[PDB]
Every structure is written in structure tokens, then in C-alpha cells.
Ligand binder design. Structure first.
Ligand SMILES: CC(C)NC(=O)N1CCN(C(=O)c2ccco2)[C@@H](C)C1
Length: 122
């Protein structure tokens, strides 16, 4: 399975699954700096799943590792903002993260395998 390009549609389909999860609701759009006027004091780099989908569809990811780093930033930002480990929105974040990690591992493995095959004889 040595298709170097296959990660992109695999990531589009996984973003579609994430958008169907009720747990994605708080993460589908950039945080509004009205309801949370301090947000930028805590969080240096906002990220959300619509920004990730747009960056992918623009042709602005070179690899599924870069997409993975942005998705993990959504979850670390939610960790940085939660008052406790017992919030609705942080709790939703940890379930969505488990689901994402379960599905992205094969995408990453297949991509890195494809790149090693492409360099086998270099
Ligand atoms: C719908 C809109 C785009 N999202 C939004 O307003 N958010 C999502 C990010 N966020 C958290 O991560 C959080 C952790 C604990 C409590 O809140 C809050 C600032 C609320």
C-alpha cells in the first residue's frame, strides 16, 4: 500500500466522521473572542476543525503529520482553557481525541511506509 498521496482523502473522510460526532460541536469553528475575551491571554495559537479542513482543501498540508499537529493543538488548547477535568467541553475534547488517535494511526503508518518505499533504492 505505497500510495504517497492516499493520506489526503483518508484525512478528508476522518474529518467528515469528526463533523458527524456530537462531541465536535465546540471545535467546529474558531472560538469567538466576545464570550471569551481573555482567550488570547491563555491560548497563543487558536485552532479548530474548520481551519484544519480549509488548510487541507487549500493544498497547504505537505503531510498527515502536519494535519495531526494542528488537530492535537485543538485538544491541547481545550486542556489549557478548562477550569477542571470535569467540564462538558473538556470531557467532549478527550473523547474526540481518543477517536481521532484511533483512526489517524493507520494514516500516519501507511504514509511513512509509502515514503520509505519511494526511497528504497534512492
Ligand atoms: C462554539 C465555539 C466555536 N467554541 C467555543 O466557544 N469554545 C470551545 C473551546 N473552549 C474550550 O475548549 C473549553 C474548555 C473548557 C471550557 O471551554 C471554550 C472557549 C468554548
Amino acid at each position: 500500500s505505497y500510495d504517497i498521496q492516499a493520506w489526503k482523502k483518508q484525512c478528508e473522510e476522518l474529518l467528515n466522521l469528526i463533523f458527524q460526532c456530537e462531541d465536535s460541536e465546540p471545535f467546529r469553528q474558531p472560538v469567538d473572542l466576545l464570550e471569551y475575551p481573555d482567550y488570547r491571554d491563555i491560548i497563543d495559537t487558536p485552532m479548530d476543525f474548520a481551519t484544519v479542513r480549509e488548510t487541507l482543501e487549500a493544498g497547504n498540508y505537505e503531510s498527515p503529520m502536519e494535519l495531526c499537529k494542528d488537530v492535537r493543538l485543538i485538544f491541547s488548547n481545550s486542556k489549557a482553557y478548562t477550569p477542571s477535568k470535569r467540564s462538558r467541553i473538556y470531557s467532549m475534547s478527550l473523547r474526540l481525541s481518543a477517536f481521532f488517535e484511533e483512526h489517524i494511526s493507520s494514516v500516519l503508518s501507511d504514509y511513512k511506509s509509502a515514503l520509505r518505499f519511494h526511497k528504497r533504492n534512492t
